[PDB]
């Protein structure tokens, strides 16, 4: 069978919709992981600071309290692995495969997070 396919392809084609990363000037501060440029990252990429903390928690067994701009989280971890983590967050955690859009906002629809983009309107499932 090779007749109802071209139309579908056409339809697919029709429905189709880095400088934004801030330079991080941070050296490997020991004992406790401290970040002062985290606020800027939160601002520019448009995301809540608590989400980043949650992500960090998910990644590694660290204990710390939230401080309002510069965070106090226990752990002697490297400046390049944090960078890698940030890169990962920028990539396969947020953004979209079909469109490379900037503005993504937080909405909750059952209990786990389902992030939405403001440029068009499409839902994606992120957990891993």
């Amino acid at each position: 069978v090779g007749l109802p396919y071209s139309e579908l392809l056409s339809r697919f084609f029709n429905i189709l919709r880095k400088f934004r990363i801030p330079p991080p000037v941070c050296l490997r501060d020991g004992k406790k992981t401290i970040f002062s440029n985290i606020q800027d990252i939160a601002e520019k990429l448009h995301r809540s600071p608590e989400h980043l903390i949650q992500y960090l928690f998910a990644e590694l067994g660290t204990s710390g309290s939230v401080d309002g701009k510069r965070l106090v989280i226990k752990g002697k971890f490297q400046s390049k692995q944090m960078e890698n983590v940030l890169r990962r967050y920028i990539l396969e955690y947020v953004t979209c495969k079909t469109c490379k859009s900037i503005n993504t906002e937080l909405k909750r629809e059952n209990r786990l997070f389902f992030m939405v983009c403001k440029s068009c309107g499409s839902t994606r499932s992120v957990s891993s």
Binding site: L8, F12, N110
Partner: protein, 408 residues
């Protein structure tokens, strides 16, 4: 609004690490359970899906929620049908579950992706199995066309066409779909509705229930005065199940912890049935329905009730501790993108065997040309007939050899 239950069964099969469960979820609604005590037991996908069409053509009509406010229609949708999706993994090792699904299924869904090699063995094997177990309704689906250019997809399609020529199944629709976009599901629904003629089920032949997953549905820290029975999540092959039946579990469990295997089967009684959202009395076959039986929460755990069968008092499912398998060997080992010839069997070595619905490790006793005898460690049974697929140790993870038949 009072909603009807499932009568027609739809199954989805493909290849490992491609994504099937996710696709199923996208098609349906709420997230599946499988893949400490709850949810996980054996790899399967279960969720409720709704067939409510709005006619006031093309492709777009269907939606996720019952309240429809997406394309441009204010009112309700007309009554068509309801479905509960059952998903089986497309692994060269996990085959018993697929086989089980096959007998049950009324509609089939096949998946091929454009990121690996073109000539495929596992898919072919699956097709052969389908052909064998009296099935004709097959639907071909395309997995991922997101980073692809323009011509590669076309080439792939051409290759597929070339491949499917000398086969039994011909009446097949080809739809290219996405899993994560949450669009292009209405078209699929439409296809499911239109192209397939709906078959009815008969309740005269002897009833069978195949439990793949075991559950304990309670709050973590349940009180003694209010205790619910152990729910057995099983797919029904044939025979309508109603409230008030004496159920038995077949294969038997190792209770002494010298080692004996000969013991009586375990009997249990139904408390309540869990289907769709609201509670129902009767259970229509074709789907994975939670049968709440009087079984302990301690008994249902992880690697003991994998593929244990359920039947009414005084029945015909056969108990096995030692299994008879008649194997047909292929020319060469298939699955690699290096190729090796199939060697003759060697005594006393651990290999994984798949019959009925069970996926468990076994030991080799005797060496022959066509037949084999194997000793089982964890509970296993054979239903009516069904095919066999063997998986052997070659390199780290288990690999396929071919197909087999059961004489008993």
């Amino acid at each position: 609004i009072i909603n009807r239950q499932a009568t027609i069964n739809i199954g989805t099969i493909g290849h490992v690490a491609h994504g099937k469960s996710t696709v199923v979820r996208a098609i349906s609604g709420v997230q599946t359970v499988r893949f400490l005590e709850r949810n996980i037991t054996i790899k399967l996908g279960y969720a409720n899906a709704k067939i409510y069409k709005c006619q006031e053509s093309f492709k777009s009509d269907k939606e996720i929620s019952p309240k429809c406010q997406r394309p441009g229609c204010p009112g309700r949708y007309k009554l068509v049908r309801h479905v509960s999706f059952v998903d089986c993994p497309g692994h060269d090792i996990l085959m018993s579950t697929m086989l089980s699904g096959a007998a049950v299924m009324d509609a089939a869904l096949l998946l091929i992706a454009g990121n690996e090699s073109c000539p495929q063995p596992q898919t072919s094997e699956h097709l052969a199995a389908i052909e064998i177990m009296k099935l004709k309704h097959v639907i071909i689906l395309q997995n991922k066309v997101d980073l692809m250019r323009e011509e590669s997809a076309l080439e792939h399609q051409k290759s597929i066409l070339k491949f499917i020529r000398g086969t039994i199944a011909d009446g097949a629709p080809i739809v290219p779909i996405s899993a994560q976009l949450k669009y292009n599901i209405d078209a699929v629904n439409e296809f499911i509705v239109k192209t397939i003629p709906v078959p009815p089920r008969d309740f005269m032949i002897s009833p069978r229930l195949i439990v793949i997953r075991s559950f304990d549905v309670n709050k973590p820290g349940a009180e003694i005065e209010d205790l619910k029975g152990g729910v057995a999540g099983g797919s029904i092959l044939n025979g309508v199940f109603k409230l008030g039946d004496e159920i038995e579990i077949r294969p038997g469990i190792v209770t002494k912890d010298k080692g004996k295997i000969q013991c009586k089967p375990i009997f249990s009684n139904i408390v309540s049935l869990f289907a769709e959202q609201n509670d129902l009395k009767f259970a229509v076959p074709g789907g994975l329905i939670g049968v709440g039986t009087k079984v302990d929460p301690t008994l249902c755990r992880a690697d003991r009730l994998v593929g244990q069968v359920v039947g009414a008092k005084g029945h015909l499912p056969n108990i096995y501790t030692d299994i008879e398998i008649n194997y047909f060997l292929l020319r060469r080992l298939l699955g690699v993108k290096k190729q090796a010839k199939v060697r003759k069997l060697e005594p006393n070595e651990v290999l994984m065997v798949n019959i009925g619905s069970t996926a468990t490790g076994a030991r080799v006793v005797a060496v022959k040309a066509d037949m084999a005898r194997l000793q089982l460690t964890s509970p296993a049974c054979t239903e009516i007939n069904e095919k066999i697929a063997l998986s052997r140790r070659i390199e780290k993870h288990w690999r396929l050899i071919g197909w087999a038949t059961i004489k008993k």
